[PDB]
Protein backbone atom coordinates (compact mmCIF):
# COMPACT_ATOMS: atom_id res chain seq x y z
CA UNK A 1 0.00 0.00 0.00
CA UNK A 2 3.01 1.95 -0.75
CA UNK A 3 0.78 5.41 -2.24
CA UNK A 4 -1.53 5.54 0.65
CA UNK A 5 1.04 5.09 3.45
CA UNK A 6 2.78 7.73 1.91
CA UNK A 7 -0.16 9.82 1.53
CA UNK A 8 -0.91 8.99 5.19
CA UNK A 9 2.72 10.86 5.93
CA UNK A 10 2.52 13.60 3.65
CA UNK A 11 -0.99 14.50 5.17
CA UNK A 12 0.14 13.96 8.87
CA UNK A 13 3.43 16.31 8.24
CA UNK A 14 1.67 19.48 6.48
CA UNK A 15 -1.74 19.62 8.05
CA UNK A 16 -3.74 19.96 4.74
CA UNK A 17 -7.37 18.47 5.49
CA UNK A 18 -9.94 16.48 3.02
CA UNK A 19 -11.88 19.84 2.25
CA UNK A 20 -9.01 21.27 -0.07
CA UNK A 21 -8.43 18.23 -1.64
CA UNK A 22 -12.00 18.13 -2.63
CA UNK A 23 -12.19 21.51 -3.85
CA UNK A 24 -9.60 21.00 -6.19
CA UNK A 25 -11.53 18.10 -7.49
CA UNK A 26 -15.08 19.52 -7.59
CA UNK A 27 -13.44 23.12 -8.71
CA UNK A 28 -10.52 21.57 -11.33
CA UNK A 29 -8.33 25.03 -10.01
CA UNK A 30 -5.88 24.10 -6.73
CA UNK A 31 -7.18 26.17 -3.91
CA UNK A 32 -4.13 28.50 -3.16
CA UNK A 33 -3.54 27.09 0.66
CA UNK A 34 0.06 26.92 1.53
CA UNK A 35 -0.55 23.22 3.28
CA UNK A 36 -1.73 21.89 -0.21
CA UNK A 37 1.42 23.33 -1.35
CA UNK A 38 3.15 21.68 1.00
CA UNK A 39 1.39 18.45 0.88
CA UNK A 40 2.79 18.37 -2.97
CA UNK A 41 6.27 19.07 -2.04
CA UNK A 42 6.17 16.86 0.24
CA UNK A 43 4.66 14.00 -1.85
CA UNK A 44 7.62 14.94 -4.79
CA UNK A 45 10.28 14.81 -2.04
CA UNK A 46 9.00 11.45 -0.45
CA UNK A 47 9.57 10.08 -4.33
CA UNK A 48 12.74 12.03 -4.95
CA UNK A 49 11.52 13.87 -7.66
CA UNK A 50 12.49 17.82 -6.09
CA UNK A 51 15.96 18.29 -4.59
CA UNK A 52 17.12 20.63 -1.78
CA UNK A 53 18.18 23.15 -3.96
CA UNK A 54 14.16 22.93 -5.00
CA UNK A 55 14.67 21.75 -8.35
CA UNK A 56 12.67 19.41 -10.24
CA UNK A 57 13.83 16.07 -11.75
CA UNK A 58 10.99 14.07 -12.94
CA UNK A 59 13.28 12.68 -15.68
CA UNK A 60 14.70 10.07 -12.39
CA UNK A 61 11.03 8.30 -13.57
CA UNK A 62 12.21 6.99 -16.77
CA UNK A 63 15.19 5.20 -15.82
CA UNK A 64 12.55 3.63 -12.93
CA UNK A 65 9.16 3.52 -15.00
CA UNK A 66 7.67 0.92 -17.49
CA UNK A 67 8.36 2.04 -21.36
CA UNK A 68 4.84 2.64 -21.32
CA UNK A 69 4.66 5.56 -19.28
CA UNK A 70 8.15 7.15 -20.96
CA UNK A 71 5.97 9.51 -23.32
CA UNK A 72 3.71 10.69 -20.94
CA UNK A 73 6.82 11.73 -18.10
CA UNK A 74 8.93 13.06 -21.23
CA UNK A 75 6.39 15.90 -22.39
CA UNK A 76 5.43 16.90 -18.33
CA UNK A 77 9.43 16.99 -18.06
CA UNK A 78 10.04 18.63 -20.92
CA UNK A 79 7.31 21.10 -21.15
CA UNK A 80 7.30 22.15 -17.35
CA UNK A 81 10.71 21.57 -16.28
CA UNK A 82 10.74 23.54 -12.84
CA UNK A 83 8.58 26.42 -12.31
CA UNK A 84 10.35 28.17 -9.47
CA UNK A 85 8.55 29.98 -6.97
CA UNK A 86 10.04 31.83 -3.82
CA UNK A 87 10.25 28.15 -1.47
CA UNK A 88 10.10 24.45 -2.20
CA UNK A 89 6.05 24.44 -1.39
CA UNK A 90 5.83 27.16 -3.99
CA UNK A 91 7.64 25.45 -6.97
CA UNK A 92 5.89 22.71 -5.97
CA UNK A 93 2.69 24.06 -6.77
CA UNK A 94 3.40 26.09 -9.94
CA UNK A 95 5.16 23.19 -11.21
CA UNK A 96 2.31 20.73 -10.33
CA UNK A 97 0.05 23.27 -11.65
CA UNK A 98 1.89 23.36 -15.17
CA UNK A 99 1.70 19.85 -14.68
CA UNK A 100 -2.16 20.02 -14.65
CA UNK A 101 -2.46 22.44 -17.95
CA UNK A 102 0.06 19.64 -19.74
CA UNK A 103 -1.93 15.91 -19.25
CA UNK A 104 -5.19 16.71 -17.28
CA UNK A 105 -5.81 13.27 -17.55
CA UNK A 106 -2.85 11.85 -15.84
CA UNK A 107 -2.66 14.80 -13.41
CA UNK A 108 -6.47 14.55 -12.13
CA UNK A 109 -5.98 10.35 -11.59
CA UNK A 110 -3.18 11.19 -9.53
CA UNK A 111 -5.11 13.69 -7.52
CA UNK A 112 -7.15 10.88 -6.82
CA UNK A 113 -4.79 8.99 -5.60
CA UNK A 114 -2.72 11.05 -3.49
CA UNK A 115 -5.87 12.10 -1.91
CA UNK A 116 -7.33 11.16 1.47
Known amino acids: SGAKKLTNLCIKETGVTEDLFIEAQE ?3 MPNNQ ?3 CFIHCVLD ?3 LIDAD ?3 HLDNLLEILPPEF ?4 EELH ?4 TQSGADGCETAFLTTECYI ?3 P ?5 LFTTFSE
Do not use: A, E, F, Y
Open 46 to 48: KIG
Open 78 to 81: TTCG
Open 105 to 109: VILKL
Open 27 to 29: TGK
Open 101 to 103: KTN
Open 70 to 73: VPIV
Open 35 to 37: RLK
Open 54 to 56: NIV
